[PDB]
Amino acid sequence: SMLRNWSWVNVHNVHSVTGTSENVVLAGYVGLSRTHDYIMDTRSTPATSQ
Amino acid sequence: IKTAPVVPPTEQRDMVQEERVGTPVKNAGNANPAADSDNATEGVV
């Protein structure tokens, strides 16, 4: 069933949808800024109505 | 007349003390600080 699904194809003829590869390392959410702002004022929200 | 020993004025100092029962929040003057979020109908980045 894997061979019938073309597990034998050349891994170079398999093109990503974008014609590019990628290796992204972007610094992310830790949650210290959200929890600090809660202790300062618990009456706000981080989630907007949209 | 009653002469009484007092504390000389130069050996004491009045110091103003401000007594508070709690630390005010960040948006202290705002009744609804959550109306900046509830009114973001396009989104926030």
Side-chain angles (χ1 to χ4, degrees):
Chain A
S1 50
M2 296 300 155
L3 283 170
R4 295 198 173 105
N5 285 279
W6 302 0
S7 63
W8 47 263
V9 296
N10 191 356
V11 298
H12 299 293
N13 300 342
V14 172
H15 302 283
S16 181
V17 169
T18 314
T20 70
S21 161
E22 194 89 1
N23 284 263
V24 291
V25 184
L26 72 164
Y29 192 77
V30 191
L32 300 187
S33 293
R34 185 260 191 277
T35 318
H36 178 84
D37 294 328
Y38 184 84
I39 299 290
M40 301 275 118
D41 198 4
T42 76
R43 319 181 289 152
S44 316
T45 76
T48 63
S49 79
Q50 181 61 257
Chain B
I1 297 169
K2 185 179 288 292
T3 287
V6 307
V7 176
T10 73
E11 293 179 354
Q12 51 171 22
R13 216 196 284 146
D14 287 31
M15 302 155 188
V16 56
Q17 270 282 301
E18 169 80 38
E19 44 174 2
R20 66 215 272 191
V21 289
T23 309
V25 299
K26 184 162 31 73
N27 319 101
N30 217 347
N32 193 16
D36 278 276
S37 308
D38 278 352
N39 288 313
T41 66
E42 271 276 280
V44 166
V45 192

